């Protein structure tokens, strides 16, 4: 029962990582991906972070116990430590074994420490890096991710200005480009087929895909041969108050 996270990366099999996820998360589904990292110097810790393949049962309950398992110098402090992730990444499971925090660390010390805020931001970037790698390396698994967690990730644009570019690149949308309600379109995809002279990313929000797809505000862009993102989730109108540019291109509602 050697602590998995203390072993060398190159010496841990993929099946050991998936079994360890199931072990620490009480989940019988394999994780989609993970990141195992040892950090030294300014901050010193090991992190092992997982993306589940399925949303947890209590995810939409405010009082969902979530977060990471915290260890200090191999000594267990607490589970479900929410201080290490932003709320839009509350699905991430895993552990942090820190050498910077004191053995008597408390929730009081956690919120007062500049250590925690820096650690949370570093771990955030590690998660975004992991998801970007998944999106590139395994599209089928990324689509599963998006189906399970996209609505949570859409909280990110308002919560986290620092990573807005990275976060935006993880979003997926339906669009007019092909006649399908599948949320397969990335903003990078959209930008890569922008027409000569097109300077904005066009969208419409509606209460459903059907309502979006059949809007008369689409007729004009369909004549210019311009793609329109079809946003039909409850969170979308609100998210678009924060996601106002991408790759230097402003967003524009087709209705205004």
Curated annotation (Swiss-Prot):
It comes from the Bacteria. It is found in: Cytoplasm; Cell inner membrane. Residues 108-256 are annotated as: B. Phosphorylated. ATP binds at residue 26. Homodimer. Oligomerizes at 65 degrees Celsius. Belongs to the heat shock protein 90 family. Molecular chaperone. Has ATPase activity. This is Chaperone protein HtpG. The lineage of its organism: Bacteria, Pseudomonadati, Pseudomonadota, Gammaproteobacteria, Enterobacterales. The gene is htpG. The chain holds residues 230 to 485 of 624 of the full protein.
């Amino acid at each position: 029962a050697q602590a998995l996270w203390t072993r060398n990366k190159s010496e841990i099999t993929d099946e050991e990582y998936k079994e360890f996820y199931k072990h620490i998360a009480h989940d019988f589904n394999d994780p989609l991906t993970w990141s195992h990292n040892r950090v030294e110097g300014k901050q010193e810790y090991t992190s092992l972070l997982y993306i589940p393949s399925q949303a947890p049962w209590d995810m939409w309950n405010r009082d969902h116990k979530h977060g990471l398992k915290l260890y200090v110098q191999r000594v267990f402090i607490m589970d479900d430590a929410e201080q290490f992730m932003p709320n839009y990444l509350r699905f991430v499971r895993g552990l942090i074994d820190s050498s910077d925090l004191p053995l008597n660390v408390s929730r009081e010390i956690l919120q007062d420490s500049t250590v925690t805020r820096n650690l949370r931001n570093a771990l955030t970037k590690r998660v975004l890096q992991m998801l970007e790698k998944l999106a590139k390396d395994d599209a089928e698994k990324y689509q599963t991710f998006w189906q399970q967690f996209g609505l949570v990730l859409k909280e990110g644009p308002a919560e986290d200005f620092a990573n807005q570019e990275a976060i935006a690149k993880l979003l997926r949308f339906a669009s007019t480009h092909t006649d399908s309600s599948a949320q397969t379109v990335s903003l990078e995809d959209y930008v890569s087929r922008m027409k000569e002279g097109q300077e904005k990313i066009y969208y419409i929000t509606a209460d459903s895909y059907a309502a979006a797809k059949s809007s008369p505000h689409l007729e004009l862009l369909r004549k210019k041969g311009i793609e329109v993102l079809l946003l039909s989730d409850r969170i979308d109108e609100w998210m678009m108050n924060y996601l106002t540019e991408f790759d230097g291109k402003p967003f524009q509602s087709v209705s205004k």
